[PDB]
Amino acid sequence: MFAIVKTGGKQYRVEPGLKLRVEKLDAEPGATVELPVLLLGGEKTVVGTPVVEGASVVAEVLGHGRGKKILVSKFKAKVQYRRKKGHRQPYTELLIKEIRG
Amino acid sequence: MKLSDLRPNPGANKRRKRVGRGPGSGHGKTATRGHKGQKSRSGGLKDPRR
Amino acid sequence: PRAKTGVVRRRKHKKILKLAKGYWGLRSKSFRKARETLFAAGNYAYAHRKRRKRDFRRLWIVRINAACRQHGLNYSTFIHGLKKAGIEVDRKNLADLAVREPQVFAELVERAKAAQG
Amino acid sequence: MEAKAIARYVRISPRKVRLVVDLIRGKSLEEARNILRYTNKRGAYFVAKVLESAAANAVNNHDMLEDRLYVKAAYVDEGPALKRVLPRARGRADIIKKRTSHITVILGEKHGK
Amino acid sequence: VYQIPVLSPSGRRELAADLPAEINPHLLWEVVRWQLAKRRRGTASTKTRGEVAYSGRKIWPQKHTGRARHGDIGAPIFVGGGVVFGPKPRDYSYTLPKKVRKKGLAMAVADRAREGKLLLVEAFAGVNGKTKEFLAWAKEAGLDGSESVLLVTGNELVRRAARNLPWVVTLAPEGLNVYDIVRTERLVMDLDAWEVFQNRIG
RNA sequence: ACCGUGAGGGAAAGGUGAAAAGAACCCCGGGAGGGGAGUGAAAUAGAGCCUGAAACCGUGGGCUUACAAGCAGUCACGGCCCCGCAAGGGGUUGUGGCGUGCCUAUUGAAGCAUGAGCCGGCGACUCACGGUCGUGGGCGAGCUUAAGCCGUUGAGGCGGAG
RNA sequence: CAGGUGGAGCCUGGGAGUGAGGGCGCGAGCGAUAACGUCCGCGUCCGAGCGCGGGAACAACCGAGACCGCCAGCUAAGGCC
RNA sequence: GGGGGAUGACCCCAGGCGGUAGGGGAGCGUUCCCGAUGCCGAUGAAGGCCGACCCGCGAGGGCGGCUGGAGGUAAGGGAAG
Ligand SMILES: [Mg+2]
Ligand SMILES: [Mg+2]
Ligand SMILES: [Mg+2]
Ligand SMILES: [Mg+2]
Ligand SMILES: [Mg+2]
Ligand SMILES: [Mg+2]
Ligand SMILES: [Mg+2]
Ligand SMILES: [Mg+2]
Ligand SMILES: [Mg+2]
Ligand SMILES: [Mg+2]
Ligand SMILES: [Mg+2]
Ligand SMILES: [Mg+2]
Ligand SMILES: [Mg+2]
Ligand SMILES: [Mg+2]
Ligand SMILES: [Mg+2]
Ligand SMILES: [Mg+2]
Ligand SMILES: [Mg+2]
Ligand SMILES: [Mg+2]
Ligand SMILES: [Mg+2]
Ligand SMILES: [Mg+2]
Ligand SMILES: [Mg+2]
Ligand SMILES: [Mg+2]
Ligand SMILES: [Mg+2]
Ligand SMILES: [Mg+2]
Ligand SMILES: [Mg+2]
Ligand SMILES: [Mg+2]
Ligand SMILES: [Mg+2]
Ligand SMILES: [Mg+2]
Ligand SMILES: [Mg+2]
Ligand SMILES: [Mg+2]
Ligand SMILES: [Mg+2]
Ligand SMILES: [Mg+2]
Ligand SMILES: [Mg+2]
Ligand SMILES: [Mg+2]
Ligand SMILES: [Mg+2]
Ligand SMILES: [Mg+2]
Ligand SMILES: [Mg+2]
Ligand SMILES: [Mg+2]
Ligand SMILES: [Mg+2]
Ligand SMILES: [Mg+2]
Ligand SMILES: [Mg+2]
Ligand SMILES: [Mg+2]
Ligand SMILES: [Mg+2]
Ligand SMILES: [Mg+2]
Ligand SMILES: [Mg+2]
Ligand SMILES: [Mg+2]
Ligand SMILES: [Mg+2]
Ligand SMILES: [Mg+2]
Ligand SMILES: [Mg+2]
Ligand SMILES: [Mg+2]
Ligand SMILES: [Mg+2]
Ligand SMILES: [Mg+2]
Ligand SMILES: [Mg+2]
Ligand SMILES: [Mg+2]
Ligand SMILES: [Mg+2]
Ligand SMILES: [Mg+2]
Ligand SMILES: [Mg+2]
Ligand SMILES: [Mg+2]
Ligand SMILES: [Mg+2]
Ligand SMILES: [Mg+2]
Ligand SMILES: [Mg+2]
Ligand SMILES: [Mg+2]
Ligand SMILES: [Mg+2]
Ligand SMILES: [Mg+2]
Ligand SMILES: [Mg+2]
Ligand SMILES: [Mg+2]
Ligand SMILES: [Mg+2]
Ligand SMILES: [Mg+2]
Ligand SMILES: [Mg+2]
Ligand SMILES: [Mg+2]
Ligand SMILES: [Mg+2]
Ligand SMILES: [Mg+2]
Ligand SMILES: [Mg+2]
Ligand SMILES: [Mg+2]
Ligand SMILES: [Mg+2]
Ligand SMILES: [Mg+2]
Ligand SMILES: [Mg+2]
Ligand SMILES: [Mg+2]
Ligand SMILES: [Mg+2]
Ligand SMILES: [Mg+2]
Ligand SMILES: [Mg+2]
Ligand SMILES: [Mg+2]
Ligand SMILES: [Mg+2]
Ligand SMILES: [Mg+2]
Ligand SMILES: [Mg+2]
Ligand SMILES: [Mg+2]
Ligand SMILES: [Mg+2]
Ligand SMILES: [Mg+2]
Ligand SMILES: [Mg+2]
Ligand SMILES: [Mg+2]
Ligand SMILES: [Mg+2]
Ligand SMILES: [Mg+2]
Ligand SMILES: [Mg+2]
Ligand SMILES: [Mg+2]
Ligand SMILES: [Mg+2]
Ligand SMILES: [Mg+2]
Ligand SMILES: [Mg+2]
Ligand SMILES: [Mg+2]
Ligand SMILES: [Mg+2]
Ligand SMILES: [Mg+2]
Ligand SMILES: [Mg+2]
Ligand SMILES: [Mg+2]
Ligand SMILES: [Mg+2]
Ligand SMILES: [Mg+2]
Ligand SMILES: [Mg+2]
Ligand SMILES: [Mg+2]
Structure with missing residues (x-):
């Protein structure tokens, strides 16, 4: 059984026993957090409205961090214009433990 | 007091003279001169104050 | 004091040549051709993240519009179904639902052409 | 074990002699000899010498x-260039480079029982 | 600053002084910079395309040769040609204002006196141009050479003595500069040397 | 050296090792060169000798390619190889999407406008004295010395003409 | 006289670059109620936005002013065999 | 920019952040000087060759291995071929 959740303005398919990297949260690396958000259950009929209420899913702030550096560079030709910028997108790793619903 | 502990006031030395070095600095390629004719030329203009 | 170029120039040239590993012919071997090649790869990257988001949607949608075309439904309609029923959930991303969880998908369609008929 | 001989600063163009070296690569010594004797190239002579000097090692x-023993490996690398002036029409002078090769035959025993 | 110790042969008395309460860690810096610069030799040099040894002939004709265009081979673009805006011999000296020279000198002492790393003395004992003699006097003055020492006296034989100590910089009293105070951890003067110092300033 | 009748022009080219201990002798070879032996802390320090980059040229291996089409990359998935328990990462590229080199000059260039074969190294906003703003400080109805003279382990001070 | 706090305005100063513009709309002149022609005026965009979407492809036409990231959502022009 | 009085450097908050000629502001690195009669170095300096690692927006800085065989030079300031 699975559920569709929502965080970081995105909606992922979680299922208890699933490590998962998510747009950075605000919690202690080893806290505990449910996102009282849900939009589906892996046994149907729960679906309606934006978010089904009598349900949520809990996860442990496995820790934070910075994802791999990507180089975003820009070049405009015949105008002597070049920019170099390094980017690392902060993320939090979560473990799906229970489908409380 | 110590020699390492010298250092003057934040303004003072200022230094950081300008250049004509690379891009990025901004002050590069034509070095503050613009595409130009007589003034981008070496020796320059006539005495402009007259 | 003279300050020779010395070691500075070789070093910069190595960064680029390293970033150009795997490029074709001289584009990986000549400094100049490598730098030139890089600017391209520079802008093409940036441009193709911003448009990777595009390419997937267009992919997601096809499958939806195919899967719900198995239940007699335009994608064009379906979206209204979900719009009205408040099911603002599909995120089009979860049209892996349409392939893994057809049972679930059907319910949504059923609920889609429910409200609005 | 494997053994090698190297003829260096041989006054011949790499690209020229490389052509016969590729002709003996991987072959028995017995065959290779029979090949160089009737290969009609200036490079035969030299490669012959290197090969025979390798066996004799x-x-x-x-x-x-x-x-x-077979020819386990063989290759020729570019020695230094002999730059010489070639006088041309209208007082030009080009520079032809008399090339030079480093021949390296390397022998091993066949894995026969 | 005021409270400074004195080694009288009698007992370690104290002597008050009219030294600047506060210090300006800039005019000190402005003085050191001035010292270290006026002593430069300005002896780097190079040759322009005019002092280079090559002839003023033109290499090829301006046009139709099919190569680039050139004058002499002393032109800076040529390997072996002259250099452009390279160093010439220059004098780096400048005239720092006298009032600032004085004031910095006081302040350089006050910074020492404030940390109690100044010590006045008298006559010595182990004098005579032998370091061994000095080195024991110093020892009997808490100068174990645990720290760098600027020794100021007009006594030749005392200066002769300590001169070879890798932790002593020696100086006659009219030579009191501030560079040779900030390096040194510790300042030591005889009274006749301290005396003139109180006259240089004021 | 070389170029020029001549006046005159005018280069390139330094580095074994602590010490020659500079490789006896043997083998292939006409020699060159190498393979052993030997010297050495090290011989890809062996005398075309410290370090030994890049272009450039070879040998061997992994992935790949003979119904595809292109500024040569990028974004995706996927196969194959490799590292690691591990998830993960590295190499390669099959198909799909997108994509008009760099500099310069221009109203406007991928431009069929200029420049560049490629690589390495040299290569262009300085200095002096004046001036004008600003600024960090010193002293302020005042501020400041110049040349010189005295001193000095790279020590400073005097000097009031101006 | 009021609203208007804005990379607005004014004053004194230091440093500039520019003084080859171009296309389009509208108002005229020259031209032939020709020219991607020319010369002014009011605007605008390109120039410097040869970055994005549409216009098959295309500086200046329609949409829209790109700080970075996302395999999220709504849209504009334009489109949905 | 405003608070947070934290006077710090720290937090929430809200805005701005295409860009040529140019103006301004921060820094990185190269040679030399003081720091040095010091410190790093044969248990291996400088230089070279790799790196999928770490810190920095970036210029860069580290760290690890191989090469190399005698130099190098911090914090912090100074001057430029
Ligand atoms: Mg219900
Ligand atoms: Mg372009
Ligand atoms: Mg342009
Ligand atoms: Mg500056
Ligand atoms: Mg500069
Ligand atoms: Mg600037
Ligand atoms: Mg600029
Ligand atoms: Mg200017
Ligand atoms: Mg011009
Ligand atoms: Mg120009
Ligand atoms: Mg012009
Ligand atoms: Mg002129
Ligand atoms: Mg240089
Ligand atoms: Mg790649
Ligand atoms: Mg919707
Ligand atoms: Mg002739
Ligand atoms: Mg001359
Ligand atoms: Mg001359
Ligand atoms: Mg001469
Ligand atoms: Mg002449
Ligand atoms: Mg030509
Ligand atoms: Mg010279
Ligand atoms: Mg003077
Ligand atoms: Mg003087
Ligand atoms: Mg001494
Ligand atoms: Mg002659
Ligand atoms: Mg002659
Ligand atoms: Mg020469
Ligand atoms: Mg050499
Ligand atoms: Mg030696
Ligand atoms: Mg020697
Ligand atoms: Mg024989
Ligand atoms: Mg003979
Ligand atoms: Mg031998
Ligand atoms: Mg031995
Ligand atoms: Mg070795
Ligand atoms: Mg070693
Ligand atoms: Mg050997
Ligand atoms: Mg040996
Ligand atoms: Mg080696
Ligand atoms: Mg060696
Ligand atoms: Mg050589
Ligand atoms: Mg060598
Ligand atoms: Mg040596
Ligand atoms: Mg070598
Ligand atoms: Mg190489
Ligand atoms: Mg191959
Ligand atoms: Mg066909
Ligand atoms: Mg095929
Ligand atoms: Mg073809
Ligand atoms: Mg391709
Ligand atoms: Mg991989
Ligand atoms: Mg792959
Ligand atoms: Mg394709
Ligand atoms: Mg492709
Ligand atoms: Mg295409
Ligand atoms: Mg050009
Ligand atoms: Mg032109
Ligand atoms: Mg033109
Ligand atoms: Mg034109
Ligand atoms: Mg062409
Ligand atoms: Mg032409
Ligand atoms: Mg062209
Ligand atoms: Mg032209
Ligand atoms: Mg040529
Ligand atoms: Mg170069
Ligand atoms: Mg001046
Ligand atoms: Mg000035
Ligand atoms: Mg004198
Ligand atoms: Mg008003
Ligand atoms: Mg304004
Ligand atoms: Mg002005
Ligand atoms: Mg005009
Ligand atoms: Mg006009
Ligand atoms: Mg205009
Ligand atoms: Mg207009
Ligand atoms: Mg309009
Ligand atoms: Mg109209
Ligand atoms: Mg026109
Ligand atoms: Mg018209
Ligand atoms: Mg222009
Ligand atoms: Mg605009
Ligand atoms: Mg175009
Ligand atoms: Mg376009
Ligand atoms: Mg289009
Ligand atoms: Mg047009
Ligand atoms: Mg367009
Ligand atoms: Mg456009
Ligand atoms: Mg929509
Ligand atoms: Mg519409
Ligand atoms: Mg269409
Ligand atoms: Mg504060
Ligand atoms: Mg913001
Ligand atoms: Mg913006
Ligand atoms: Mg900007
Ligand atoms: Mg600023
Ligand atoms: Mg720096
Ligand atoms: Mg020293
Ligand atoms: Mg040792
Ligand atoms: Mg080592
Ligand atoms: Mg050095
Ligand atoms: Mg690095
Ligand atoms: Mg190293
Ligand atoms: Mg230093
Ligand atoms: Mg420093
Ligand atoms: Mg220079």
Whole structure:
């Protein structure tokens, strides 16, 4: 059984026993957090409205961090214009433990 | 007091003279001169104050 | 004091040549051709993240519009179904639902052409 | 064991002699000899010498038995260039470069039982 | 600053002084910079395309040769040609205002006196141009050479003595500069040397 | 050296090792060169000798390619190889999407406008004295010395003409 | 006289670059109620936005002013065999 | 920019952040000087060759291995071929 959740303005398919990297949260690396958000259950009929209420899913702030550096560079030709910028997108790793619903 | 502990006031030395070095600095390629004719030329203009 | 170029120039040239590993012919071997090649790869990257988001949607949608075309439904309609029923959930991303969880998908369609008929 | 001989600063163009070296690569010594004798190239002579000098290093210096050695590896690298002036029409002077090769035959015993 | 110790042969008395309460860690810096610069030799040099040894002939004709265009081979673009805006011999000296020279000198002492790393003395004992003699006097003055020492006296034989100590910089009293105070951890003067110092300033 | 009748022009080219201990002798070879032996802390320090980059040229291996089409990359998935328990990462590229080199000059260039074969190294906003703003400080109805003279382990001070 | 706090305005100063513009709309002149022609005026965009979407492809036409990231959502022009 | 009085450097908050000629502001690195009669170095300096690692927006800085065989030079300031 699975559920569709929502965080970081995105909606992922979680299922208890699933490590998962998510747009950075605000919690202690080893806290505990449910996102009282849900939009589906892996046994149907729960679906309606934006978010089904009598349900949520809990996860442990496995820790934070910075994802791999990507180089975003820009070049405009015949105008002597070049920019170099390094980017690392902060993320939090979560473990799906229970489908409380 | 110590020699390492010298250092003057934040303004003072200022230094950081300008250049004509690379891009990025901004002050590069034509070095503050613009595409130009007589003034981008070496020796320059006539005495402009007259 | 003279300050020779010395070691500075070789070093910069190595960064680029390293970033150009795997490029074709001289584009990986000549400094100049490598730098030139890089600017391209520079802008093409940036441009193709911003448009990777595009390419997937267009992919997601096809499958939806195919899967719900198995239940007699335009994608064009379906979206209204979900719009009205408040099911603002599909995120089009979860049209892996349409392939893994057809049972679930059907319910949504059923609920889609429910409200609005 | 494997043994090698190297002819260096041989006054011949790499690209020229490389052509016969590729002709003996991987072959028995017995065959290779028979090939160089009737290969119609200036490079045969030289490659012959290097090969024979290699065998004469296997038997006397590495104990390898002449009847079991093949041409495990062989290659020729570019020696230094002999730049010479070639006077041309309208007082030009070009520079032809008399090339030079480093021939390296390297022998091993065949894995025969 | 005021409270400074004195080694009288009698007992370690104290002597008050009219030294600047506060210090300006800039005019000190402005003085050191001035010292270290006026002593430069300005002896780097190079040759322009005019002092280079090559002839003023033109290499090829301006046009139709099919190569680039050139004058002499002393032109800076040529390997072996002259250099452009390279160093010439220059004098780096400048005239720092006298009032600032004085004031910095006081302040350089006050910074020492404030940390109690100043010590006045008298006559010595182990004098005579032998370091061994000095080195024991110093020892009997808490100068174990645990720290760098600027020794100021007009006594030749005392200066002769300590001169070879890798932790002593020696100086006659009219030579009191501030560079040779900030390096040194510790300042030591005889009174006749301290005396003139109180006259240089004021 | 070389170029020029001549006046005159005018280069390139330094580095074994602590010490020659500079490789006896043997083998292939006409020699060159190498393979052993030997010297050495090290011989890809062996005398075309410290370090030994890049272009450039070879040998061997992994992935790949003979119904595809292109500024040569990028974004995706996927196969194959490699590292690691591990998830993960590295190499390669099959198909799909997108995509008009760099500099310069221009109203405007991928431009069929200029420049560049490629690589390495040299290569262009300085200095002096004046001036004008600003600024960090010193002293302020005042501020400041110049040349010189005295001193000095790279020590400073005097000097009031101006 | 009021609303208007804005990379607005004014004053004194230091440093500039520019003084080859171009296309389009509208108002005229020259031209032939020709020219991607020319010369002014009011605007605008390109120039410097040869970055994005549409216009098959295309500086200046329609949409829209790109700080970075996302395999999220709504849209504009334009489109949905 | 405003608070947070934290006077710090720290937090929430809200805005701005295409860009040529140019103006301004921060820094990185190269040679030399003081720091040095010091410190790093044969248990291996400088230089070279790799790196999928770490810190920095970036210029860069580290760290690890191989090469190399005698130099190098912090914090912090100074000057430029
Ligand atoms: Mg219900
Ligand atoms: Mg372009
Ligand atoms: Mg342009
Ligand atoms: Mg500056
Ligand atoms: Mg500069
Ligand atoms: Mg600037
Ligand atoms: Mg600029
Ligand atoms: Mg200017
Ligand atoms: Mg021009
Ligand atoms: Mg120009
Ligand atoms: Mg012009
Ligand atoms: Mg002129
Ligand atoms: Mg240079
Ligand atoms: Mg790649
Ligand atoms: Mg919707
Ligand atoms: Mg002739
Ligand atoms: Mg001359
Ligand atoms: Mg001359
Ligand atoms: Mg001469
Ligand atoms: Mg002449
Ligand atoms: Mg030509
Ligand atoms: Mg010279
Ligand atoms: Mg003077
Ligand atoms: Mg003087
Ligand atoms: Mg001494
Ligand atoms: Mg002659
Ligand atoms: Mg002659
Ligand atoms: Mg020469
Ligand atoms: Mg050499
Ligand atoms: Mg030696
Ligand atoms: Mg020697
Ligand atoms: Mg014989
Ligand atoms: Mg003969
Ligand atoms: Mg030998
Ligand atoms: Mg030995
Ligand atoms: Mg070795
Ligand atoms: Mg070693
Ligand atoms: Mg050997
Ligand atoms: Mg040996
Ligand atoms: Mg080596
Ligand atoms: Mg060596
Ligand atoms: Mg050589
Ligand atoms: Mg060598
Ligand atoms: Mg040596
Ligand atoms: Mg070598
Ligand atoms: Mg190489
Ligand atoms: Mg190959
Ligand atoms: Mg066909
Ligand atoms: Mg095929
Ligand atoms: Mg073809
Ligand atoms: Mg391709
Ligand atoms: Mg991989
Ligand atoms: Mg792959
Ligand atoms: Mg394609
Ligand atoms: Mg492709
Ligand atoms: Mg295409
Ligand atoms: Mg050009
Ligand atoms: Mg032109
Ligand atoms: Mg033109
Ligand atoms: Mg034109
Ligand atoms: Mg072309
Ligand atoms: Mg032409
Ligand atoms: Mg062209
Ligand atoms: Mg032209
Ligand atoms: Mg040529
Ligand atoms: Mg170069
Ligand atoms: Mg001046
Ligand atoms: Mg000035
Ligand atoms: Mg004198
Ligand atoms: Mg008003
Ligand atoms: Mg304004
Ligand atoms: Mg002005
Ligand atoms: Mg005009
Ligand atoms: Mg006009
Ligand atoms: Mg205009
Ligand atoms: Mg207009
Ligand atoms: Mg309009
Ligand atoms: Mg109209
Ligand atoms: Mg026109
Ligand atoms: Mg018209
Ligand atoms: Mg322009
Ligand atoms: Mg605009
Ligand atoms: Mg175009
Ligand atoms: Mg376009
Ligand atoms: Mg289009
Ligand atoms: Mg047009
Ligand atoms: Mg367009
Ligand atoms: Mg456009
Ligand atoms: Mg929509
Ligand atoms: Mg519409
Ligand atoms: Mg269409
Ligand atoms: Mg504060
Ligand atoms: Mg913001
Ligand atoms: Mg913006
Ligand atoms: Mg900007
Ligand atoms: Mg600023
Ligand atoms: Mg720096
Ligand atoms: Mg020193
Ligand atoms: Mg040792
Ligand atoms: Mg080592
Ligand atoms: Mg050095
Ligand atoms: Mg690095
Ligand atoms: Mg190293
Ligand atoms: Mg230093
Ligand atoms: Mg420093
Ligand atoms: Mg220079």
